[PDB]
Amino acid sequence: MTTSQKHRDFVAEPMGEKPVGSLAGIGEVLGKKLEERGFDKAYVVLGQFLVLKKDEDLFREWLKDTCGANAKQSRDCFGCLREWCDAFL
Amino acid sequence: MTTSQKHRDFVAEPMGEKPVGSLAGIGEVLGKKLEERGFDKAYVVLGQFLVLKKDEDLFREWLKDTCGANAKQSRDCFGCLREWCDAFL
């Protein structure tokens, strides 16, 4: 896979309290905008994924409409969150 | 503990897609009201717990104000959701 080693590392161990910008697909700049919106921790963003019943179209529009992420960035967060759930929830 | 065997069974294996009324503290009648509110699965309610950063006062008021659960029923869901997270998330 051409994804960063973080993608395989995140889906290989608990997420604990790592910062939101730790999720694959979210860069340092995007992490700051979400933090200003009340998502200072990744587990709060994980909850939004659960609220959307894992719907990929609703999840991608939520991130793009919420911060302006590009279509490529949204694909990395979906598979990243979907794969973590496959291992944990 | 005087809790139902479901409490120990729920915190002993994944929650999968079991119905919301499966969470300890939620009875069949309370499960129906949440379902009408869009929580047809327990993992959608688990997400609300994550959104409240596990705050016990905010979580209990959410359930009581959301369905009318009693103070005793709210205590069972908090420890039930908090213990599940301790084993999984």
Partner-chain residue, chosen from A15, A47, A53, that has the shortest CB–CB distance to B51: A47
DSSP state of A53: T
* Domain hosting residue A39, numbered range: 1-89
CB contact under 8 A, B50 and A47: yes
What's the CA gap between A40 and B20, in Å, rounded? 28
Q: How many domains does chain A have?
A: 1
CA distance B11 to chain A (A): 13
Q: Residue ranges of the alpha helices (H) in chain A? A: 5-10, 28-36, 42-51, 56-67, 71-87
CATH of the domain at A8: 1.10.150.40
Exposure string over B31-67, b if 16+ CB within 10 A, otherwise e:
bebbeeeebebbbbbbbbbbbbeeeeeebbebbeeeb
What's the CA gap between A37 and B10, in Å, rounded? 33
Q: B53 contacts in A (CB within 8 Å)?
A: 41, 44
B16: left (phi over 0), alpha (psi -120 to 50) or beta: left
Partner-chain residue, chosen from A41, A43, A51, that has the shortest CB–CB distance to B44: A51
Which experimental technique did the depositors report for determining this structure?
A: NMR
Interface residue of B43, B49, B52, B59 to substitute, partner A, most A CBs within 10 Å: B43
- Chains A, B: CB contacts within 8 A come to 37
What's the CA gap between B26 and B37, in Å, rounded? 14
Burial class for A30, CB neighbours closer than 10 Å (0-12, 13-18, 19+): buried
